[PDB]
Amino acid sequence: VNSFSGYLKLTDNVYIKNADIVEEAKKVKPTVVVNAANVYLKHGGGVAGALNKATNNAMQVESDDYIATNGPLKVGGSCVLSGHNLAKHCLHVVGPNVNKGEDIQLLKSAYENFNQHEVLLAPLLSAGIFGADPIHSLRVCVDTVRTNVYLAVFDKNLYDKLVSSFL
Ligand SMILES: CC[C@@H](Nc1ncnc2[nH]c3cc(F)ccc3c12)c1nccs1
């Protein structure tokens, strides 16, 4: 039993809700919140900009030190950093950005990072400003993640479309 509330169950391990991931993280304080990161950990907009703003820019400060030490992530890769006031940990995961021409096949590799964590609060990878089809992202999530994932979808209209079209 966990503290996530109001989710629709899609499969044995995947759950979904129309919610603002920032507000959801502040309420649940999950062990792991997933950020929709880029390779530079520049949290300017989308989910990343919102999560970073909620940390009063502490996420960005920590991220800049991480990059200065380690260099950029790979597309499809991840790193574990602090969750600040939102979660114990933040798993920064880089899905391919279609608006940069990146290979959508890397979306499966991106979701594989979730399997290293027993329970996660997450957005749909490569959705929103990353330009992929969210219906496809949900399909890849369900077919790749085996651990327990609670998906927050900000847009109510999109949430209803994801549920109604789910196979
Ligand atoms: C992963 C893509 C998804 N983004 C989000 N998902 C869950 N929670 C979110 N909170 C936010 C707060 C913000 F300021 C900006 C963006 C988001 C956001 C979207 N898919 C379609 C349209 S936006």
PDB file of N, CA and C in Angstrom, residues 9 15 22 27 29 31 43 60 62-63 82 87 96 114 149 154:
ATOM      1  N   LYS A   9      -6.160   2.634 -12.766  1.00  0.00           N
ATOM      2  CA  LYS A   9      -5.236   1.525 -12.965  1.00  0.00           C
ATOM      3  C   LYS A   9      -5.293   1.107 -14.427  1.00  0.00           C
ATOM      4  N   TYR A  15      -0.311   3.174 -13.445  1.00  0.00           N
ATOM      5  CA  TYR A  15      -1.441   3.955 -12.970  1.00  0.00           C
ATOM      6  C   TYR A  15      -1.358   5.349 -13.580  1.00  0.00           C
ATOM      7  N   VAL A  22       3.955  18.720 -10.199  1.00  0.00           N
ATOM      8  CA  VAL A  22       4.514  19.534  -9.119  1.00  0.00           C
ATOM      9  C   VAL A  22       3.642  19.435  -7.875  1.00  0.00           C
ATOM     10  N   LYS A  27       2.440  16.916  -2.517  1.00  0.00           N
ATOM     11  CA  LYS A  27       1.482  16.257  -1.635  1.00  0.00           C
ATOM     12  C   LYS A  27       1.972  14.878  -1.200  1.00  0.00           C
ATOM     13  N   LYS A  29       5.168  13.492  -1.625  1.00  0.00           N
ATOM     14  CA  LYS A  29       6.581  13.373  -1.284  1.00  0.00           C
ATOM     15  C   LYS A  29       7.087  11.970  -1.631  1.00  0.00           C
ATOM     16  N   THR A  31       9.238   8.722  -3.027  1.00  0.00           N
ATOM     17  CA  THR A  31      10.653   8.383  -2.999  1.00  0.00           C
ATOM     18  C   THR A  31      11.357   8.896  -4.247  1.00  0.00           C
ATOM     19  N   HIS A  43      16.894  23.164 -17.044  1.00  0.00           N
ATOM     20  CA  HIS A  43      15.485  22.957 -16.717  1.00  0.00           C
ATOM     21  C   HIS A  43      14.680  24.224 -17.020  1.00  0.00           C
ATOM     22  N   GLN A  60      18.316  23.415 -10.356  1.00  0.00           N
ATOM     23  CA  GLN A  60      19.241  23.885 -11.383  1.00  0.00           C
ATOM     24  C   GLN A  60      20.657  24.034 -10.834  1.00  0.00           C
ATOM     25  N   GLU A  62      22.087  22.431  -8.339  1.00  0.00           N
ATOM     26  CA  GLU A  62      22.637  21.090  -8.180  1.00  0.00           C
ATOM     27  C   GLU A  62      22.997  20.485  -9.533  1.00  0.00           C
ATOM     28  N   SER A  63      22.121  20.682 -10.521  1.00  0.00           N
ATOM     29  CA  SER A  63      22.333  20.127 -11.851  1.00  0.00           C
ATOM     30  C   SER A  63      23.564  20.721 -12.525  1.00  0.00           C
ATOM     31  N   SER A  82      19.058  14.942  -6.032  1.00  0.00           N
ATOM     32  CA  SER A  82      18.138  15.208  -4.938  1.00  0.00           C
ATOM     33  C   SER A  82      16.732  15.503  -5.456  1.00  0.00           C
ATOM     34  N   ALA A  87      10.485  15.437  -3.306  1.00  0.00           N
ATOM     35  CA  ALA A  87      10.622  13.988  -3.272  1.00  0.00           C
ATOM     36  C   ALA A  87      11.951  13.694  -2.595  1.00  0.00           C
ATOM     37  N   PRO A  96      14.006  11.163 -26.012  1.00  0.00           N
ATOM     38  CA  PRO A  96      14.330  11.867 -27.256  1.00  0.00           C
ATOM     39  C   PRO A  96      13.398  13.053 -27.474  1.00  0.00           C
ATOM     40  N   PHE A 114      13.412   3.575 -15.482  1.00  0.00           N
ATOM     41  CA  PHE A 114      12.434   3.473 -14.404  1.00  0.00           C
ATOM     42  C   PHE A 114      12.541   2.135 -13.670  1.00  0.00           C
ATOM     43  N   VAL A 149       4.612   2.502 -11.568  1.00  0.00           N
ATOM     44  CA  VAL A 149       4.721   3.862 -12.068  1.00  0.00           C
ATOM     45  C   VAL A 149       3.363   4.551 -12.011  1.00  0.00           C
ATOM     46  N   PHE A 154      -0.786  16.485 -17.060  1.00  0.00           N
ATOM     47  CA  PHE A 154      -1.251  17.828 -16.716  1.00  0.00           C
ATOM     48  C   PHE A 154      -2.544  18.183 -17.440  1.00  0.00           C
TER      49      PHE A 154
END
